[PDB]
Symmetry: C3
Subunit: 206 residues, 3 copies
């Protein structure tokens, strides 16, 4: 209920979260996500440690199926930038920064942290596959690798997508898709930190 | 009014604004955000007509159909020069999802640092201690066509590499691929990068 | 722009030890964007073992990797065991450094909570498990800015204990290719990390 130390320029999970995320089951993972506002862009840092279930100890020798070689983590946001319930991330410690924790009250508005609707539109598809007015599927996308245990020999194909989701009537979204072709033998899903940026939505006029 | 001199951009949803093969054959979305001593940049390229709108290296083998470059040339004041791939009409400081009413006079603080990224590196028989870095002017990475991890494109961002139109600063995007792509539009995933900024003139 | 940048200078003299004293130029710029540091790093080695890599004539594993460490004290000052010399490691003034050594750069240090110095999980319950990998960024830089000359690059935060350091930034470089007369001249790498907060002043 009010502090001098709360910065509305950082929206985060806290830097050292308790289990806060669903990969396979409730609270089976720690998502560390920091969104820092640098004006027109968000500067983001993401790492995922899964602490129990299917992906806490990957073994594709003993679990060869394709459902054991990929998963997705979704953040769904409403018109005001609030986290919606169908999200992978629990909202309890998803809030503006105060020291190494969150502000006293849940945030009302985080639109300026949302991926820009104009740059990253949710998309309409009829007929005209190309009148040369065609809009970019890929632009909403960052494609890279993270590395399990910070080992360069354990890559995981990582796709960050902006405003790709429609679930729970969301207006904005950030999706992390992880997938690997290597057949990993007893490798915890513990991802190296990934820096990325996206163009920010502006605050509403009045 | 709402005009933000901490962002220099193409607008987030540009009309065709770029030449890859021919005039206005592509949409370059480039956002430069000033974070003091560094520029934070996001770039994506959609080509909407010509050679690279639908890559088919089965029907177009050989290497002029497997690479191209996009150049931004800047003068002493950071203004976009005419030989640039990018058209300057909607290259300007931000105003609420568009550009400011008038063309900018100065964007030096957005330019790649001359000291960090000197125009000409040629280390002679110079002493080791005096040697300058060719690679430092360079970022080497991949973007992915259609946001598909199986469609990589070797991407080099180069700073102050260009001499064209007697430019003092430049940003170059070189794209190339070895995969023989069958009907893949050049529609690149977004690339985040940073570079060291030139200081403002005089009393900075 | 000035107390918000901690750097090597953009065009440094030899300032770094890879094999021997002042055998390399580390360009490191740390820019404060509030809760995160925005970083650019590039390494040119100008003499010794790694100035002209030849793994045909020097096949051993000690010729195919090396590490560059920055060790920091409680106040964020560079400690002497560091690879980087502290003479031109300071807050920015134009394309150079301030007249006097800095007293405090805690707000540039990698967050202790996000990147704990010792965090090992013998007799830890799942919920209490701490991440080795989170302290890590793993990527490639490219020698000469050539896409055919990759170097596996790991940036690690608060991994070092040397000289009783409180914070650290480590650059590990390694390659499997057998390079024949390739100077170690790395392409620039952008990265960010979560920043330590300034300590509470007047309570
Ligand atoms: N270097 C500028 C900075 C302007 C400011 O910080 O307001 C000046 O003092 O002229």
């Amino acid at each position: 209920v009010g502090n001098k130390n709360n910065d509305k320029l950082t929206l985060w999970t806290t830097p050292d979260p308790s289990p806060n995320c669903k990969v396979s089951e409730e609270k089976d993972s720690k998502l560390t996500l920091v969104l820092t506002k640098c004006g027109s862009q968000i500067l983001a840092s993401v790492s995922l440690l899964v602490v129990k279930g299917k992906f806490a100890n990957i073994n594709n020798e003993t679990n060869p199926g394709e459902d054991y070689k990929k998963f997705s983590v979704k953040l769904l946001f409403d018109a005001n930038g609030k986290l919606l319930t169908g999200s992978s991330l629990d909202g309890n410690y998803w809030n503006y920064k105060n020291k190494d924790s969150v502000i006293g009250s849940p945030y009302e508005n985080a639109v300026p942290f949302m991926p820009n609707s104009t740059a990253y539109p949710k998309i309409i598809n009829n007929g005209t596959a190309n009148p040369e007015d065609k809009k970019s599927a890929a632009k909403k996308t960052i494609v890279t690798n993270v590395y399990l245990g910070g080992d360069a020999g354990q890559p995981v194909a990582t796709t960050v997508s902006f405003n790709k989701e429609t679930e729970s009537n969301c207006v904005y979204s950030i999706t992390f898709d992880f997938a690997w072709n290597k057949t990993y033998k007893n490798v915890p899903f513990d991802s190296s930190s990934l820096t990325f940026s996206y163009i920010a939505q502006d605050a509403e006029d009045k």
